[PDB]
Design a protein around this ligand. Sequence first.
Ligand SMILES: *[C@@H]1O[C@H](CO)[C@@H](O[C@@H]2O[C@H](CO)[C@@H](O[C@@H]3O[C@H](CO)[C@@H](O)[C@H](O[C@H]4O[C@H](CO)[C@@H](O)[C@H](O)[C@@H]4O)[C@@H]3O)[C@H](O)[C@H]2NC(C)=O)[C@H](O)[C@H]1NC(C)=O
Ligand SMILES: *[C@@H]1O[C@H](CO)[C@@H](O[C@@H]2O[C@H](CO)[C@@H](O[C@@H]3O[C@H](CO)[C@@H](O)[C@H](O[C@H]4O[C@H](CO)[C@@H](O)[C@H](O)[C@@H]4O)[C@@H]3O)[C@H](O)[C@H]2NC(C)=O)[C@H](O)[C@H]1NC(C)=O
Ligand SMILES: COCCOCCOCCOCCOCc1cn(CCCC[C@H](NC(=O)N[C@@H](CCC(=O)O)C(=O)O)C(=O)O)nn1
Ligand SMILES: COCCOCCOCCOCCOCc1cn(CCCC[C@H](NC(=O)N[C@@H](CCC(=O)O)C(=O)O)C(=O)O)nn1
Ligand SMILES: *[C@@H]1O[C@H](CO)[C@@H](O[C@@H]2O[C@H](CO)[C@@H](O)[C@H](O)[C@H]2NC(C)=O)[C@H](O)[C@H]1NC(C)=O
Ligand SMILES: *[C@@H]1O[C@H](CO)[C@@H](O[C@@H]2O[C@H](CO)[C@@H](O)[C@H](O)[C@H]2NC(C)=O)[C@H](O)[C@H]1NC(C)=O
Ligand SMILES: *[C@@H]1O[C@H](CO)[C@@H](O[C@@H]2O[C@H](CO)[C@@H](O)[C@H](O)[C@H]2NC(C)=O)[C@H](O)[C@H]1NC(C)=O
Ligand SMILES: *[C@@H]1O[C@H](CO)[C@@H](O[C@@H]2O[C@H](CO)[C@@H](O)[C@H](O)[C@H]2NC(C)=O)[C@H](O)[C@H]1NC(C)=O
Ligand SMILES: *[C@@H]1O[C@H](CO)[C@@H](O[C@@H]2O[C@H](CO)[C@@H](O)[C@H](O)[C@H]2NC(C)=O)[C@H](O)[C@H]1NC(C)=O
Ligand SMILES: *[C@@H]1O[C@H](CO)[C@@H](O[C@@H]2O[C@H](CO)[C@@H](O)[C@H](O)[C@H]2NC(C)=O)[C@H](O)[C@H]1NC(C)=O
Ligand SMILES: *[C@@H]1O[C@H](CO)[C@@H](O)[C@H](O)[C@H]1NC(C)=O
Ligand SMILES: *[C@@H]1O[C@H](CO)[C@@H](O)[C@H](O)[C@H]1NC(C)=O
Ligand SMILES: *[C@@H]1O[C@H](CO)[C@@H](O)[C@H](O)[C@H]1NC(C)=O
Ligand SMILES: *[C@@H]1O[C@H](CO)[C@@H](O)[C@H](O)[C@H]1NC(C)=O
Ligand SMILES: *[C@@H]1O[C@H](CO)[C@@H](O)[C@H](O)[C@H]1NC(C)=O
Ligand SMILES: *[C@@H]1O[C@H](CO)[C@@H](O)[C@H](O)[C@H]1NC(C)=O
Ligand SMILES: [Ca+2]
Ligand SMILES: [Ca+2]
Ligand SMILES: [Cl-]
Ligand SMILES: [Cl-]
Ligand SMILES: [Zn+2]
Ligand SMILES: [Zn+2]
Ligand SMILES: [Zn+2]
Ligand SMILES: [Zn+2]
Lengths: 694, 694
Amino acid sequence: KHNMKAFLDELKAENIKKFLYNFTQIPHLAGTEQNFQLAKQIQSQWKEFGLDSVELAHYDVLLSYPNKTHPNYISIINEDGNEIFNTSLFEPPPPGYENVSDIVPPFSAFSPQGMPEGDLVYVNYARTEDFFKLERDMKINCSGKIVIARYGKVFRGNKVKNAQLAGAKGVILYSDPADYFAPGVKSYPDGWNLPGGGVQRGNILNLNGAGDPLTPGYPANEYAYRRGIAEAVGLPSIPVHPIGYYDAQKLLEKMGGSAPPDSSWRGSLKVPYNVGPGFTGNFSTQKVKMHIHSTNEVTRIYNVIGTLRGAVEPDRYVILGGHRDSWVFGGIDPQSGAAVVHEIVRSFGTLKKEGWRPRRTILFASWDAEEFGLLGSTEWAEENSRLLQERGVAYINADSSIEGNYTLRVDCTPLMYSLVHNLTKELKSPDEGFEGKSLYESWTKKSPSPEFSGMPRISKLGSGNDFEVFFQRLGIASGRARYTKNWETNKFSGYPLYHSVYETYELVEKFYDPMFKYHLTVAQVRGGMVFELANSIVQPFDCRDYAVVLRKYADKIYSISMKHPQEMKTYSVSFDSLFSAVKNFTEIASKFSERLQDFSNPIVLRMMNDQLMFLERAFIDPLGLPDRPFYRHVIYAPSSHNKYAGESFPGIYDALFDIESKVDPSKAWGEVKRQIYVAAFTVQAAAETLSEVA
Amino acid sequence: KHNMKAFLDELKAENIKKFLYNFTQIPHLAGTEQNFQLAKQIQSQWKEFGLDSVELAHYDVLLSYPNKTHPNYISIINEDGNEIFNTSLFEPPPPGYENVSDIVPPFSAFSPQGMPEGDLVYVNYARTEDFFKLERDMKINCSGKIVIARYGKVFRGNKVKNAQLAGAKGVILYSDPADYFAPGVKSYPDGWNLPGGGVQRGNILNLNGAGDPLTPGYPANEYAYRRGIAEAVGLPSIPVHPIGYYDAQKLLEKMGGSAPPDSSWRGSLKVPYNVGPGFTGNFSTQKVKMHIHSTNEVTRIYNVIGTLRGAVEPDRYVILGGHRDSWVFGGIDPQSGAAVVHEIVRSFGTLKKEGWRPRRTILFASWDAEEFGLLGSTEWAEENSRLLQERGVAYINADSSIEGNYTLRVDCTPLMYSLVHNLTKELKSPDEGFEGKSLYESWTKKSPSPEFSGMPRISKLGSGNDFEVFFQRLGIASGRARYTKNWETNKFSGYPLYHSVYETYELVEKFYDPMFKYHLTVAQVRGGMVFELANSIVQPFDCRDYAVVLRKYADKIYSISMKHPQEMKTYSVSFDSLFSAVKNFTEIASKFSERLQDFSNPIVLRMMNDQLMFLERAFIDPLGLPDRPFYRHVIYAPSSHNKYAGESFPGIYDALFDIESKVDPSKAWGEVKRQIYVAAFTVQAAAETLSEVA
Ligand SMILES: *[C@@H]1O[C@H](CO)[C@@H](O[C@@H]2O[C@H](CO)[C@@H](O[C@@H]3O[C@H](CO)[C@@H](O)[C@H](O[C@H]4O[C@H](CO)[C@@H](O)[C@H](O)[C@@H]4O)[C@@H]3O)[C@H](O)[C@H]2NC(C)=O)[C@H](O)[C@H]1NC(C)=O
Ligand SMILES: *[C@@H]1O[C@H](CO)[C@@H](O[C@@H]2O[C@H](CO)[C@@H](O[C@@H]3O[C@H](CO)[C@@H](O)[C@H](O[C@H]4O[C@H](CO)[C@@H](O)[C@H](O)[C@@H]4O)[C@@H]3O)[C@H](O)[C@H]2NC(C)=O)[C@H](O)[C@H]1NC(C)=O
Ligand SMILES: COCCOCCOCCOCCOCc1cn(CCCC[C@H](NC(=O)N[C@@H](CCC(=O)O)C(=O)O)C(=O)O)nn1
Ligand SMILES: COCCOCCOCCOCCOCc1cn(CCCC[C@H](NC(=O)N[C@@H](CCC(=O)O)C(=O)O)C(=O)O)nn1
Ligand SMILES: *[C@@H]1O[C@H](CO)[C@@H](O[C@@H]2O[C@H](CO)[C@@H](O)[C@H](O)[C@H]2NC(C)=O)[C@H](O)[C@H]1NC(C)=O
Ligand SMILES: *[C@@H]1O[C@H](CO)[C@@H](O[C@@H]2O[C@H](CO)[C@@H](O)[C@H](O)[C@H]2NC(C)=O)[C@H](O)[C@H]1NC(C)=O
Ligand SMILES: *[C@@H]1O[C@H](CO)[C@@H](O[C@@H]2O[C@H](CO)[C@@H](O)[C@H](O)[C@H]2NC(C)=O)[C@H](O)[C@H]1NC(C)=O
Ligand SMILES: *[C@@H]1O[C@H](CO)[C@@H](O[C@@H]2O[C@H](CO)[C@@H](O)[C@H](O)[C@H]2NC(C)=O)[C@H](O)[C@H]1NC(C)=O
Ligand SMILES: *[C@@H]1O[C@H](CO)[C@@H](O[C@@H]2O[C@H](CO)[C@@H](O)[C@H](O)[C@H]2NC(C)=O)[C@H](O)[C@H]1NC(C)=O
Ligand SMILES: *[C@@H]1O[C@H](CO)[C@@H](O[C@@H]2O[C@H](CO)[C@@H](O)[C@H](O)[C@H]2NC(C)=O)[C@H](O)[C@H]1NC(C)=O
Ligand SMILES: *[C@@H]1O[C@H](CO)[C@@H](O)[C@H](O)[C@H]1NC(C)=O
Ligand SMILES: *[C@@H]1O[C@H](CO)[C@@H](O)[C@H](O)[C@H]1NC(C)=O
Ligand SMILES: *[C@@H]1O[C@H](CO)[C@@H](O)[C@H](O)[C@H]1NC(C)=O
Ligand SMILES: *[C@@H]1O[C@H](CO)[C@@H](O)[C@H](O)[C@H]1NC(C)=O
Ligand SMILES: *[C@@H]1O[C@H](CO)[C@@H](O)[C@H](O)[C@H]1NC(C)=O
Ligand SMILES: *[C@@H]1O[C@H](CO)[C@@H](O)[C@H](O)[C@H]1NC(C)=O
Ligand SMILES: [Ca+2]
Ligand SMILES: [Ca+2]
Ligand SMILES: [Cl-]
Ligand SMILES: [Cl-]
Ligand SMILES: [Zn+2]
Ligand SMILES: [Zn+2]
Ligand SMILES: [Zn+2]
Ligand SMILES: [Zn+2]
């Protein structure tokens, strides 16, 4: 029989291992020849594997690269202007890769050029609250200073935005061992920790969903009209560069000025973590000087798009997409994901060769330039937006399959919660001590839901990955899953070697997943979700789960507002309309569920499948959120303080945020009321899409 | 049998006559009790007629009314400040209506209050080119002057916008006999001409598709957050008031200053049509003073929404909508349309009572507040936008059924051209001399297509009626049809008694359509289109007709640009991408048509019906046109100089318009190139929705 079990059984750990090795021997940086060659290889293999069509879709987008003959670095300079200390020009390459060429040195992509010299101010994680504390409580002025911030906690683009707004003239990012060195584990190559010479690459844009900085709204095709650089979306105005903790220690150790305000400002280095500005007395005349010479350059990128045509509903698309470009070797990010996608394609193609097809069309994507701002997925979705909004059932992301070896992690729309619970109950746990138990059991035990007994935690989608255009711009139900660490015994950020040269095949094979069993489990979860979404007669979405979360989010945003009872009285700020809309959504969803269970009629079925498919779409507001026109989903947007985190009722959240500091409270509370109206209207409008159609 | 013929045969001229008489005995001004009573009557009757559900959908919107105890008027004042001439406080009511109360006096809805005094400047029709001629060629400065403009040629909202931008401090609108008095016909009540005391009411907003000025984007429901007046959309900044030609003659006859520049500036009154500023020597110290005291007031309005549920595709909507609010009695506008809708509902309900239902759902709408800015249709569409964009097949408008008695007039999307040609070939001509001939034959003979032999003229949709939100905001295929005059023997504007108290049942019954046969023909055309759209197995849209017009519009916009060959060379302005996209659309449409003809499979059918339905939707750009976010259709928008007229490739048209006057030609030609890209991309994207889906 051709059923889910046949699909799942065909997936092999050893194939995923072979593919990951194949994908990680040389760098595959976006816009380089090596990554175009890998695109062509994947295209050829997906055709071999049996897909109906496999094409490259290319775009010409703004990318950023260091200047090979004028390297980026930072100095401490003395009074005479002699550079008495320089940061590294490259990470020491790992064993056996010391002769690999075309390793891009650490840099912050899209930094402008400049050579600013000045006094340092240390800004902790450069979060909104870190700058509040500096400016409001400590009265430290960052204007015209170079800021040094530790990585961690929030997206580094938000750090740079916050430093720019505080008036900084440059930003130095570094990895503190507090956040990237787990106690008791060895540095690479002897363990999975970040060595003192390791450095995290990464872009520092604030695109807010725009895609290619030069062509917001429209694909960067052959005839596209491009903005000039000065009108580009999301570029930073001040130079930025990342360093490791050996170099950081040399910059921090001389810091004077004010003491750190409390222990949450101290990392693990043997330095006082003084805030500055500038150095202690003996060194007060020394300064820090950046030298940044990277260039922004329009460059061709290539997505691979494979199609497995549906037997019954070929005009309904279930998309499995993940990126292929990497900063260096991409051992975890993204090739641990891409190898899993490759094996999923192979398994679906095996069934296809025996005469099976899924009910709906499945699209498979190998995106380019994710690392430079989700560029490949976003341009392709801009090109195909009309097809996607009228035919897109679901998008399942497939970046890094692992960031630890402890338990499952899933972030998804509420519409997929029931699907995920049901699928994981049918999958075997790969965990030690859970032999013969379901993945649901191990996952629920290790990661309990904060709200419900006997259920696992599933998070909201944030951003910083390729589902962003599909979910928050276009309103297509989206999900992602991977194996993760235990956050409770682990205070560190993501995984330590993230975006470093040390992220290699050997890192994964030796330290993360020697038997490829966590990868296989992740292929079963992503692959199984795609299988159900593409083959279930009725869409496997439960609108009732959206009703439950909408109530939770309404309670949450009301509770934020209720910190200001005087203002709510003065300005007549009521959440009544929002709770009313949520109550209505609950009632209508419950009645729709009864009809869905209670209807041989393919029109009523497809009418009902269309109501399920367009339910996520109903949360889109075509006017977007304030000053972020590509974040159109009214329930979820990436946090305005941290692109990685999701925020619920973001329009009301941002209206309330720091409202006690607004100079015109009438206007500010007016805008809170406006956002309440927009949210209540959108919830009620979404509910009404589930009412009887006539 | 229950087929189109049964539907059509049930329509009766005498019923339309009875309904028009019923609808026109008292005024039905938006927001008044009388129009709420009529809404309730129509709701009750539509239920009686057999519709499945008939509801009122109400909204609270900004309306405008004169102050009953402080009337609007205009004066000529002397040096001492004595008002030596005053314009009328009301139109002399017609015979037998001299005791009807609640006739709103002539006013310009949404005018601000004020009593500006100043010198007059006469500005012809107050068109963009009239102001170019005054300022650029004649060097006449309108700043701080009161402008007097004749009605006609363009929407009066555009006249007011143009006068405001020229620096006018008030605007007087009047009806010149050149434009509202057909030679050889008598004034009302003895003929259908405008008497010297007659005055055209009408709003002077520039909403650009926004709907209620206070709630752009969102329905004006019970909890809506409203803009303050100073942030409202589209309100005029200077007072405006309309007068008849007896009063106009008194204002114009003393005009001095410059002579009219040529005969196209002279109307038919016995005055020189001097441009001014101010009066001839003896009267040079006299001034004109306006007194405007109207108020803007949020007021409840009521749409009636009737539903005839589809038997097979109840989640596909064909909408027949027209408004019910009138300035006074609404003899032509809108009740000649509303009586036709009423009889269509009655006929469909007759078939329903015998057990028939249409394949798709038909929605019937009696909109309110059309006269105040398309408010009722637009708020309802804002409320229901998610249902409409995913389920809306077509919208057929139903305002005035007649504006003459000569031949048919149709304006519609190219997708309905074939449907209209085929339907009119099956209908009887009502014209004298065409007894026994089809409506197609009479219409084609009287109104030949400018492009094609043996076909009738069908125009683009402009705006200034209730299809605007459905077509240019939401991208739902739309059409309208009515009987019209012979434009060739008739230099006058619309019909003479438009928006005057003289537009009565008697005007229609005595002078326009005594036998109600043109009304019946119009009911057959609107009703027949709805019947086909709602019952044809395959949608009756032909995508090939869009390909033909897109080529015509591309040739047209290229020819405009080619007036500037030097600039096109300097700035490398190419239309190649647009012609390429149009060529591709042509090829893909031709192949889709073959598949449509060449496919027992209801999924392939509905998949194909969905491609037909979403084809108009594909021309929507969610970012809208520049500074007009509610005009989202890239092929058609209302002209930025005349809301009544449609413009094709409006984004490129407005980029090119008066470009030789722009101070930075590099920037201006850059924006032309940007609009070419947007248009070529949208055409290609629309074409791709017709490609095989996988
Ligand atoms: C959740 O669903 C419920 C329906 O189950 C829906 O209830 C609707 O609520 C509105 C209130 O927002 C009701 O509106 C009323 O309608 C009547 C006519 O039907 C009007 O007369 C009322 O207006 C008068 O009273 C107002 C309130 O004091 C005054 O402000 C006003 O000036 C008038 O005096 C009022 O407009 C509507 O009837 C119900 N609909 C029902 C019960 O079917 C509710 O709105 C939904 N929630 C959301 C957020 O949409
Ligand atoms: C109408 O439909 C046709 C298809 O029937 C479609 O043709 C496409 O045109 C584009 C050009 O805009 C072609 O793009 C080329 O693709 C190849 C790889 O396939 C690239 O190598 C080419 O780039 C090189 O050459 C350029 C031009 O000189 C240089 O600028 C560039 O730097 C590279 O050197 C180029 O990108 C595309 O292949 C075809 N697709 C086909 C034939 O299937 C056409 O675009 C459609 N019209 C519109 C308006 O969409
Ligand atoms: C409710 O009250 C809130 C209280 O606050 C506490 C909890 O909220 C915070 C939620 O944290 C979300 C996590 O933020 C921290 C973080 C995460 N990370 C891991 C980064 C892994 C990102 C990787 N994506 C990625 O590398 N993409 C590129 C490009 C992304 C882009 O350009 O958008 C990049 O990030 O550089 C991925 O998705 O796997 N690092 N720091
Ligand atoms: C290609 O080169 C162009 C050369 O230019 C020549 C041809 O282009 C011009 C096309 O003319 C379009 C007609 O404009 C002139 C006109 C039309 N009218 C008739 C008005 C009838 C409007 C009525 N609608 C209406 O009354 N709606 C209200 C409210 C509309 C609103 O608020 O949007 C109103 O107009 O006050 C209807 O649709 O029946 N008066 N003047
Ligand atoms: C990754 O695997 C691919 C597929 O096997 C390898 O590419 C093939 O290489 C062989 C031997 O050079 C060629 O004859 C084939 O034409 C290639 N097939 C393709 C490109 O589809 C590639 O060598 C492997 N890379 C590494 C680093 O092991
Ligand atoms: C840090 O690097 C800089 C730049 O390479 C070094 O300064 C240069 O030294 C060379 C050779 O002695 C001089 O000719 C250049 O004029 C210097 N350039 C600048 C910009 O000052 C510096 O010596 C290095 N410092 C350390 C401690 O290694
Ligand atoms: C997850 O599985 C549950 C349990 O099988 C499904 O809920 C059942 O669905 C069937 C089929 O409609 C109903 O007859 C049962 O009453 C349901 N049991 C319940 C609600 O406890 C549920 O549909 C599945 N979720 C999916 C497929 O998304
Ligand atoms: C327009 O027609 C309607 C429908 O016949 C008339 O309203 C009816 O009036 C009768 C007699 O007063 C009442 O008993 C009914 O209840 C009404 N039916 C409704 C409102 O649905 C109305 O009188 C007519 N108006 C004019 C001016 O002739
Ligand atoms: C035009 O109307 C105005 C306003 O009614 C007339 O002027 C008023 O005349 C009355 C009675 O004689 C005075 O008490 C008011 O003071 C005047 N008002 C103003 C604003 O001037 C005027 O007489 C009328 N002119 C004509 C020719 O009928
Ligand atoms: C208008 O009528 C024409 C003529 O009947 C229709 O065109 C025919 O459609 C049939 C059915 O598919 C084809 O087999 C014929 O070849 C067509 N004749 C032609 C193109 O000359 C046309 O479809 C109708 N338009 C509608 C329904 O929108
Ligand atoms: C990089 O630096 C070199 C060497 O100083 C310079 O000549 C060249 O212009 C730069 N390259 C780019 C792409 O800016
Ligand atoms: C911070 O520094 C600059 C002076 O160089 C000044 O313009 C700015 O206003 C200062 N802000 C403060 C002290 O709050
Ligand atoms: C793998 O799991 C073991 C057992 O808990 C743990 O000690 C080790 O730290 C894990 N490896 C990684 C990379 O997390
Ligand atoms: C209308 O004018 C009267 C009489 O002068 C005035 O008292 C009243 O305030 C005005 N009404 C409105 C609605 O402004
Ligand atoms: C028109 O009139 C005013 C003077 O009252 C002036 O400010 C404006 O610039 C003038 N424009 C001209 C003469 O072009
Ligand atoms: C009705 O038609 C006749 C015949 O052409 C014409 O003379 C008359 O002007 C028409 N009436 C109207 C209102 O157009
Ligand atoms: Ca783009
Ligand atoms: Ca509104
Ligand atoms: Cl992922
Ligand atoms: Cl109409
Ligand atoms: Zn990644
Ligand atoms: Zn990454
Ligand atoms: Zn009308
Ligand atoms: Zn009108």
